[PDB]
Structure 1
Amino acid sequence: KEKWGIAHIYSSFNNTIIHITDITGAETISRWSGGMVVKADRDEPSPYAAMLAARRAAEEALEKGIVGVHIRVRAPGGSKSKTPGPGAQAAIRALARAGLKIGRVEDVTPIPHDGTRPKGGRRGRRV
Structure 2
Amino acid sequence: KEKWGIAHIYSSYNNTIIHITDITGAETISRWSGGMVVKADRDEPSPYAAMLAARRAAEEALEKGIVGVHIRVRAPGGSKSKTPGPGAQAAIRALARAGLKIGRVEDVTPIPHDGTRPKGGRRGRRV
Q: TM (normalized to structure 1)?
A: 0.98
Whole-angstrom distance in 1 between the partners of 2:51 and 2:33: 11
Once the two structures are TM-superposed, the CA of residue 60 in structure 1 deviates from its matched residue by 0.5
Alpha-carbon distance, 1:80 to partner = 0.6
Match of 1:25, SS state, is coil
Question: How many residues were matched structurally?
Answer: 127
Q: In the alignment, which residue of structure 1 is the partner of 2:123?
A: 123
- The alignment partner of 1:118 has SS state of coil
% identity of equivalent residues: 99
* CA deviation profile, 1:22-56 (whole Å, cap 9, x unmatched): 11100111000111100001111000000100010
CA–CA distance in structure 2, aligned partners of residues 66 and 58 of structure 1: 9
For residue 78 of structure 1, report the CA deviation from its aligned partner. Answer: 0.3
Runs of 4+ in 1 over 3 A off after TM superposition: none
Q: Distance in 2 between matches of 1:85 and 1:58?
A: 21
Q: Equivalent residues in 2 for 1:28-107 (5 A)?
A: 28-107=28-107
Q: Distance in 2 between matches of 1:38 and 1:25?
A: 28
The alignment's TM-score, normalised by the length of structure 2, stands at 0.98
Q: Which residues of structure 2 form unaligned runs of 5+?
A: none
Gaps in structure 1 of 5+ consecutive residues: none
